[PDB]
UniProtKB/Swiss-Prot annotation:
Pfam families: S1-P1_nuclease. It comes from Aspergillus oryzae (strain ATCC 42149 / RIB 40) (Yellow koji mold). Coiled coil: none annotated. The record marks D45, K48 as: Important for catalytic activity. Its cofactor is Zn(2+). Its EC number is 3.1.30.1. It catalyses: Endonucleolytic cleavage to 5'-phosphomononucleotide and 5'-phosphooligonucleotide end-products. One of its GO terms (molecular function) is nucleic acid binding. Residues 115-163 are annotated as: Substrate binding. Hydrolyzes only single-stranded DNA and RNA without apparent specificity for bases. This is Nuclease S1. Disulfide bonds join C72-C216, C80-C85. The gene is nucS.
Length: 267
């Protein structure tokens, strides 16, 4: 996601973690503000574009070698690659937090988990084609951009009604109520089914495979003839909106559940 989407995921997670989880995270981050997770949600995207952080660029995605829109699927060995991927990073950084929660590595590990659980839920972060859709140029409300970027940024910002922090917080709030009592409330139990703190690869693969299904059902279903040539602020946005809203909600809820498990490590 872009900045607003990561902030939204983080605020959702803040609303669903247990209090002891909040304390566990605030202690690592050195921040007990109202925005303790949101303040670090976008960090990994800023860090990766430096000499120090470049090793972590692969950790934002898993380049599924499927054939969308006619065939979607993710396979960890096939798709992760030797430089690593979102799934391998969730394993590594989760295990750092389970083994070494107050060592020097914990702070970055936590910021990576907050960010990457968000990224796994953006379907094009679970797809190889054209570098996760970065190579597919499109027009969005008259602007030339690419398909990856509209899923990260243009469409979530349109749906939220802006780009600023207050806009992200309002959007998170909306999605938290959909989880608690509204349109996602009957599904949220399923969203945490299968979560296993002793198996971060399997756990995060549930989420990656889930998000990847939407590559075929929503991202690329229209075909590139249409996608390359039509302004995607029209019907493409209209049908995409409920999909990315539910995926952002899932990301925040799953992030909260995962943080609860890390903070509850037997100790
Ligand atoms: N050439 C680029 C492309 C993207 N980004 C940043 C801004 C985007 O919002 C973010 C996207 O990261 P991710 O795809 O991991 O969500 O990375 C950047 O600084 N430079
Ligand atoms: N195979 C890839 C390559 C990139 N990205 C994401 C991470 C980058 O932040 C963003 C923009 O890519 P780039 O850095 O190539 O401009 O897209 C992705 O999800 N899948
Ligand atoms: C795990 O994270 C540490 C700290 O960033 C890094 O040194 C190491 O290479 C990572 N390992 C894997 C397999 O991602
Ligand atoms: C769509 O654009 C891509 C480049 O992003 C190109 O390879 C492909 O041939 C185009 N397809 C159609 C049907 O226009
Ligand atoms: Na249910
Ligand atoms: Zn992102
Ligand atoms: Zn992205
Ligand atoms: Zn990222």
């Amino acid at each position: 996601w872009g900045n607003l989407g990561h902030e939204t995921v983080a605020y959702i997670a803040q609303s669903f973690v247990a209090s002891s989880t909040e304390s566990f995270c605030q202690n690592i981050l050195g921040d007990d503000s109202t925005s303790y997770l949101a303040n670090v949600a976008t960090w990994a995207d800023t860090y990766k574009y430096t000499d120090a952080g470049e090793f972590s660029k692969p950790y934002h995605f898993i380049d599924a070698q499927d054939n969308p829109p006619q065939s979607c699927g993710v396979d960890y060995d096939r798709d992760c690659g030797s430089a690593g991927c979102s799934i391998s990073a969730i394993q590594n950084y989760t295990n750092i937090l389970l083994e070494s929660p107050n060592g020097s590595e914990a702070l970055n590990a936590l910021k990576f988990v907050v960010h990457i659980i968000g990224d796994i839920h953006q379907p094009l972060h679970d797809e190889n084609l054209e570098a996760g859709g970065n190579g597919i140029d499109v027009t969005y409300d008259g602007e030339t951009t690419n398909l990856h970027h509209i899923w990260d940024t243009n469409m979530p910002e349109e749906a939220a009604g802006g780009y600023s922090l207050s806009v992200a917080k309002t959007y998170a709030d909306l999605l938290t109520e959909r989880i608690k009592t509204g349109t996602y409330s009957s599904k949220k139990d399923s969203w945490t089914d299968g979560i296993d703190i002793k198996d971060p690869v399997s756990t995060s693969m549930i989420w990656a495979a889930d998000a990847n299904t939407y590559v075929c059902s929503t991202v690329l279903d229209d075909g590139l003839a249409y996608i390359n040539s039509t302004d995607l602020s029209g019907e493409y946005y209209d049908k995409s909106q409920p999909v990315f809203e539910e995926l952002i909600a899932k990301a925040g809820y799953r992030l909260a559940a995962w943080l609860d498990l890390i903070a509850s490590q037997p100790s």
